[PDB]
Design a protein around this motif. Structure first.
Motif, PDB file in Angstrom:
ATOM      1  N   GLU A 274       0.825  -1.204   0.000  1.00 21.14           N
ATOM      2  CA  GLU A 274       0.000   0.000   0.000  1.00 21.14           C
ATOM      3  C   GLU A 274       0.861   1.257   0.000  1.00 21.14           C
ATOM      4  OE1 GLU A 274      -2.902  -0.044   3.105  1.00 21.14           O
ATOM      5  OE2 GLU A 274      -3.476   2.057   2.840  1.00 21.14           O
ATOM      6  N   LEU A 275       1.931   1.264   0.799  1.00 22.81           N
ATOM      7  CA  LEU A 275       2.778   2.447   0.891  1.00 22.81           C
ATOM      8  C   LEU A 275       3.600   2.658  -0.374  1.00 22.81           C
ATOM      9  CD1 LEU A 275       3.977   4.804   2.514  1.00 22.81           C
ATOM     10  CD2 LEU A 275       5.486   3.160   3.637  1.00 22.81           C
ATOM     11  N   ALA A 276       3.938   1.581  -1.086  1.00 19.77           N
ATOM     12  CA  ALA A 276       4.773   1.709  -2.277  1.00 19.77           C
ATOM     13  C   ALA A 276       4.065   2.508  -3.365  1.00 19.77           C
ATOM     14  CB  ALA A 276       5.162   0.324  -2.793  1.00 19.77           C
ATOM     15  N   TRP A 277       2.788   2.207  -3.609  1.00 18.67           N
ATOM     16  CA  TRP A 277       2.035   2.926  -4.630  1.00 18.67           C
ATOM     17  C   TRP A 277       1.630   4.319  -4.171  1.00 18.67           C
ATOM     18  CZ3 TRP A 277      -1.060  -2.161  -4.971  1.00 18.67           C
ATOM     19  CH2 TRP A 277      -0.454  -3.027  -5.889  1.00 18.67           C
ATOM     20  N   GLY A 278       1.421   4.513  -2.869  1.00 20.28           N
ATOM     21  CA  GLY A 278       1.034   5.815  -2.360  1.00 20.28           C
ATOM     22  C   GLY A 278       2.152   6.829  -2.270  1.00 20.28           C
ATOM     23  N   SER A 279       3.406   6.400  -2.429  1.00 17.96           N
ATOM     24  CA  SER A 279       4.529   7.326  -2.355  1.00 17.96           C
ATOM     25  C   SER A 279       4.658   8.191  -3.603  1.00 17.96           C
ATOM     26  CB  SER A 279       5.829   6.555  -2.131  1.00 17.96           C
ATOM     27  OG  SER A 279       6.108   5.695  -3.221  1.00 17.96           O
ATOM     28  N   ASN A 280       4.094   7.760  -4.733  1.00 16.15           N
ATOM     29  CA  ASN A 280       4.186   8.479  -6.005  1.00 16.15           C
ATOM     30  C   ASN A 280       2.808   8.560  -6.655  1.00 16.15           C
ATOM     31  OD1 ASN A 280       4.496   5.670  -6.077  1.00 16.15           O
ATOM     32  ND2 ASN A 280       5.341   5.711  -8.156  1.00 16.15           N
ATOM     33  N   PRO A 281       1.926   9.426  -6.145  1.00 18.91           N
ATOM     34  CA  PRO A 281       0.617   9.595  -6.801  1.00 18.91           C
ATOM     35  C   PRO A 281       0.705  10.127  -8.222  1.00 18.91           C
ATOM     36  CG  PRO A 281       0.592  10.518  -4.586  1.00 18.91           C
ATOM     37  CD  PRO A 281       2.019  10.216  -4.906  1.00 18.91           C
ATOM     38  N   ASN A 282       1.782  10.825  -8.576  1.00 13.47           N
ATOM     39  CA  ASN A 282       1.915  11.476  -9.873  1.00 13.47           C
ATOM     40  C   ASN A 282       2.624  10.615 -10.914  1.00 13.47           C
ATOM     41  OD1 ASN A 282       0.725  13.760  -8.685  1.00 13.47           O
ATOM     42  ND2 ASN A 282       2.723  14.595  -8.090  1.00 13.47           N
ATOM     43  N   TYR A 283       2.938   9.358 -10.595  1.00 11.20           N
ATOM     44  CA  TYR A 283       3.639   8.460 -11.503  1.00 11.20           C
ATOM     45  C   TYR A 283       2.876   7.147 -11.612  1.00 11.20           C
ATOM     46  CZ  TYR A 283       7.534  11.710 -10.901  1.00 11.20           C
ATOM     47  OH  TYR A 283       8.322  12.839 -10.858  1.00 11.20           O
ATOM     48  N   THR A 284       3.200   6.388 -12.657  1.00 16.43           N
ATOM     49  CA  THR A 284       2.508   5.133 -12.916  1.00 16.43           C
ATOM     50  C   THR A 284       2.766   4.132 -11.797  1.00 16.43           C
ATOM     51  OG1 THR A 284       4.379   4.342 -14.238  1.00 16.43           O
ATOM     52  CG2 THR A 284       2.594   5.471 -15.400  1.00 16.43           C
ATOM     53  N   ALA A 285       1.737   3.354 -11.468  1.00 18.23           N
ATOM     54  CA  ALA A 285       1.831   2.308 -10.453  1.00 18.23           C
ATOM     55  C   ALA A 285       2.363   1.048 -11.124  1.00 18.23           C
ATOM     56  CB  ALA A 285       0.477   2.066  -9.800  1.00 18.23           C
ATOM     57  N   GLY A 286       3.640   0.749 -10.895  1.00 17.56           N
ATOM     58  CA  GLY A 286       4.277  -0.389 -11.517  1.00 17.56           C
ATOM     59  C   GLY A 286       3.995  -1.690 -10.791  1.00 17.56           C
ATOM     60  N   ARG A 287       4.499  -2.771 -11.379  1.00 13.39           N
ATOM     61  CA  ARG A 287       4.334  -4.095 -10.798  1.00 13.39           C
ATOM     62  C   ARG A 287       5.141  -4.221  -9.510  1.00 13.39           C
ATOM     63  NH1 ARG A 287       6.480  -7.440 -15.773  1.00 13.39           N
ATOM     64  NH2 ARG A 287       6.607  -9.013 -14.116  1.00 13.39           N
ATOM     65  N   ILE A 288       4.641  -5.054  -8.599  1.00 18.41           N
ATOM     66  CA  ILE A 288       5.308  -5.357  -7.337  1.00 18.41           C
ATOM     67  C   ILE A 288       5.338  -6.869  -7.167  1.00 18.41           C
ATOM     68  CG2 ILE A 288       5.164  -5.249  -4.816  1.00 18.41           C
ATOM     69  CD1 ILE A 288       3.920  -2.382  -5.237  1.00 18.41           C
ATOM     70  N   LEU A 289       6.495  -7.394  -6.774  1.00 19.51           N
ATOM     71  CA  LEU A 289       6.681  -8.812  -6.497  1.00 19.51           C
ATOM     72  C   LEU A 289       6.742  -9.018  -4.990  1.00 19.51           C
ATOM     73  CD1 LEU A 289       9.444  -9.517  -9.162  1.00 19.51           C
ATOM     74  CD2 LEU A 289       7.000  -9.994  -9.394  1.00 19.51           C
ATOM     75  N   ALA A 290       5.972  -9.987  -4.494  1.00 18.50           N
ATOM     76  CA  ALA A 290       5.801 -10.214  -3.067  1.00 18.50           C
ATOM     77  C   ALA A 290       6.071 -11.674  -2.729  1.00 18.50           C
ATOM     78  CB  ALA A 290       4.390  -9.830  -2.611  1.00 18.50           C
TER      79      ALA A 290
END
Lengths: 553, 52, 58, 59
Positions: A66-82
């Motif tokens: 959740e925090l990874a995508w919320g750190s850059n509201p003005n940029y594309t939400a890229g893939r995340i591996l978990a």
């Protein structure tokens, strides 16, 4: 060059050779930490928060996503591996003739309830699964009863039987019998009668025999999975072919939460909770976990642990893949409210160009509204998420962080010391009424500023992608091709086009095309090129000079 | 340059990149002295005599 | 050229350069070379919207 | 059987035309794939059909 026709023909004709040529990085982010869902030692590609929540029920790993995508509201939400560090196991319970296993791993699976009930009216089983945590409650009614067989002839009696292979315990024949002698038999080994649909059609074609598919959905179960029946009277009443185990797989192979396996005779059993769910003890070392991220294509990894031992393993992991042609970088943070002296110890121990240490820790406002105070390494997720969303060669210097507050507000002198020691620090800007937080620099643990490739993440990031992309493209294109006379010219043209795209995307500053020289001799093909690397501004010097001016008229 | 949609999609679609650029001192005075009100070691912004 | 013109007329191809069409005849063989720009279906539309200021007077 | 409609639609179209974004005229579908699900099928080279919910006249 695809020819046409592909089959040669020696008679007169016209041949056309079709040349399809001339018409023909993501920087994925990674996360490792505790979670309450997902298989162990498995990497899952994440694109939306809903997918992560369904996969990972809860934990610090979900918050990091959740925090990874919320750190850059003005940029594309890229893939995340978990990945889930916990070596969880699935809840299971051996009751009746079915081995019940839960797809959910951990203690949460213990709450799953499974029970079978027999419908006397239809002579069919009824499966019900209850799981209060997800509010999941569905009933799989009319289990079995795939189709009917009926006989309308004037003979005294008619019966049918099913034969099973001893070695495989699978149905092989389905014989229809009138009186004593056999009338007709269907071979279920394969071919014409792979599925039960073909059997139903052939039965209706006969004069006396009739059959109808069950109305409770289109089952189309395989003929090999039919149950064993012998000497069943047809004339008195229609006989239902049960195939209880086969029907369960169709409705549960890719649906529901609970899977089933056959050990035995399947019979109803009362509603009972599953057992055996256990997250297990935490791993002693994360080296085995990191190996699964080797060929996943990720670049940035943020281990969600404050232990120095965990940081060292990730530091070695990124180095190992870089030596193998798959460069990666790591961002880590130490504990809660660590002092400058403690941070120097962590930085000195690593001394890795491909590792960055985060000092500041603070509180982030989540989507749920919680003002969750988090350690330093959770702040690295925001920096890692911000870095992944940025273009190739860009820096996280002076970019906003969007953090509610920080435990320590370092002064100007304190920030300089951390920067001199290769530690990333976050400053609270008090020079304006609209105060905000920003990253002073993206310096790595390697304190040698003479080498900006190792010292600066952005400069090294551009070098890695530039070198790695060039390495892959050349192998797929030129290796295996003939060393024709124009090979050197073609290679030079390919290099110029590749470098032109980098300049177009601002991944490099500029390159001289003339200096690009290609030498081909035997198997080897020596290439030489010059590139002016892209750099991020970090010092602006202004020389203001005052002078006199004379006015007239 | 804010993209649209922020979530990438690989299926056919239309993407719009929005560039918001191109559309986007007070000399405050200070006083220190004795007073019969206000918290100690605290700076208060004053705009009207009634507030002071 | 007539055959390729019909394809362009029916929008089966985008365009072709007539000059590049070269024909070489030698014995039984008749080598033919041509260039064609293939027709393609749109699958991605990129828009770069830029906002700017404007000044009004009178 | 849905492929027959796609095949029939493709045959009726002119040479070089595509069946992309064309209507299907189907009453309903067993599975209504989400945006993420459609992308995965496209990435794996599988044709998928989406229920358009962006307008009142859904199709």
């Amino acid at each position: 060059v695809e020819p046409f026709p592909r089959r040669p023909i020696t008679r007169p004709h016209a041949s056309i050779e079709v040349d399809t040529s001339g018409i023909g990085s993501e920087k994925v982010f990674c996360l490792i930490g505790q979670a309450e869902g997902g298989e162990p030692n498995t990497v899952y590609e994440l694109r939306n928060y809903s997918q992560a929540k369904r996969l990972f029920r809860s934990g610090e790993l979900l918050d990091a996503i959740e925090l990874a995508w919320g750190s850059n509201p003005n940029y594309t939400a890229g893939r995340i591996l978990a990945m889930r560090i916990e070596d969880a196991k699935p809840a299971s319970a051996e009751i009746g003739g079915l081995k019940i296993t839960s797809k959910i791993y951990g203690n949460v699976a213990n709450n799953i309830q499974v029970g079978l009930e027999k419908n006397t009216l239809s002579d069919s089983l009824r499966l019900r699964v209850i799981f209060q945590d997800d509010r999941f409650n569905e009933v799989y009614d009319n289990i079995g009863n795939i189709f009917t067989i009926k006989y309308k002839g004037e003979e005294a009696n008619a019966t049918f039987s099913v034969e099973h292979d001893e070695e495989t315990q699978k149905a092989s024949r389905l014989v229809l019998k009138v009186g004593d002698q056999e009338v007709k038999s269907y071979d279920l080994t394969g071919g014409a009668y792979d599925y039960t649909n073909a059997i139903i059609t052939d039965i209706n074609q006969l004069p006396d025999f009739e059959a109808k598919l069950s109305p409770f959905g289109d089952k189309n179960l395989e003929s090999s999975k039919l149950d064993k029946i012998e000497n069943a009277n047809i004339k008195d009443k229609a006989v239902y072919v049960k195939a209880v185990f086969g029907d369960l797989e169709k409705q549960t192979a890719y649906n529901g939460i609970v899977s089933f396996e056959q050990l035995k005779t399947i019979e109803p059993f009362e509603l009972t909770k599953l057992k055996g769910g256990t997250n297990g003890e935490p791993p002693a070392t994360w080296a085995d976990k990191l190996d699964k991220f080797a060929h996943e294509g990720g670049y940035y990894i943020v281990p969600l642990s404050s232990k120095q031992s965990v940081h060292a393993e990730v530091a070695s992991f990124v180095k190992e893949r870089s030596d193998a042609g798959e460069p990666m970088r790591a961002i880590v943070g130490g504990g809660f409210n660590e002092s400058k002296e403690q941070l120097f110890g962590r930085q000195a121990s690593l001394s890795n160009p491909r590792v960055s240490l985060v000092a500041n820790s603070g509180t982030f406002v989540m989507d749920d509204g919680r003002k969750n105070h988090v350690p330093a390494y959770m702040v690295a997720v925001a920096l890692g998420g911000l870095a992944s969303g940025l273009e190739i060669g860009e820096s996280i210097t002076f970019k906003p962080l969007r953090v509610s507050s920080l435990d320590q507000i370092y002064e100007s002198i304190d920030l300089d010391e951390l920067n001199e020691n290769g530690i990333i620090s976050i400053e609270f800007v008090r020079n304006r009424t609209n105060t905000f937080f920003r990253i002073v620099d993206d310096v790595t643990t390697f304190n040698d500023k003479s080498d900006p490739v190792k010292a600066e993440m952005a400069v090294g990031e551009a070098n890695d992608f530039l070198v790695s992309e060039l390495k892959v493209q050349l192998e797929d294109q030129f290796i295996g091709t003939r060393t024709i006379n124009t090979s050197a010219s073609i290679i030079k043209d390919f290099i110029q086009s590749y470098l032109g795209r980098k300049k177009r995307d601002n991944e490099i500053q500029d390159f001289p095309a003339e200096d690009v020289q290609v030498i081909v001799e035997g198997n080897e093909a020596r290439i030489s090129m010059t590139v002016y690397p892209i750099r991020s501004f970090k010092k602006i010097s202004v020389s203001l000079v005052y002078k006199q001016q004379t006015l007239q008229a």
